[PDB]
Amino acid sequence: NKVTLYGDCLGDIAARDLICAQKFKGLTVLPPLLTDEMIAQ
Amino acid sequence: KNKCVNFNFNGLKGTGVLTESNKKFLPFQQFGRDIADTTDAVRDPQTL
Ligand SMILES: *[C@@H]1O[C@H](CO)[C@@H](O)[C@H](O)[C@H]1NC(C)=O
């Protein structure tokens, strides 16, 4: 909690997000192989 | 609207989906530019 990290970004023209603009300029973020449930296990 | 089109609005060529925009343009403003300076909104010439 202390550390803060197409159809969604198509409807996100009313708001402004830096993730949608980075996706539209071709810069995507791959997910990690291990989820937080697995690093916690 | 809601389809990919090779658009030529007032001589601005582009390839993108076009949708209705909540953004309001002042009369002098005809185009909207994002952080990368790429047009993100265009006021249609035939229909404002
Ligand atoms: C342009 O023509 C269309 C079709 O008649 C009309 O709907 C529109 O209001 C016109 N726009 C201007 C700025 O005259």
From Swiss-Prot, chain A:
Location of region: Disordered: 5-22
Where do the segments described as Fusion peptide 2 lie? 6-24
Q: What is the effect of changing T28N?
A: In strain: Lambda/C.37
S-S pairs: C9-C20
Q: Which domain of life is it from?
A: Viruses
Q: What does this protein do?
A: Subunit of the fusion protein that is processed upon entry into the host cell. Mediates fusion of the virion and cellular membranes by functioning as a class I viral fusion protein. Contains a viral fusion peptide that is unmasked after S2 cleavage. This cleavage can occur at the cell membrane by host TMPRSS2 or during endocytosis by host CSTL. In either case, this triggers an extensive and irreversible conformational change that leads to fusion of the viral envelope with the cellular cytoplasmic membrane, releasing viral genomic RNA into the host cell cytoplasm.
Q: What is this protein called?
A: Spike protein S2'
In which organism is this protein found? Answer: Severe acute respiratory syndrome coronavirus 2 (2019-nCoV)
**Name of the gene:** S
Q: Which residues of the full protein are shown?
A: 824 to 872 of 1273
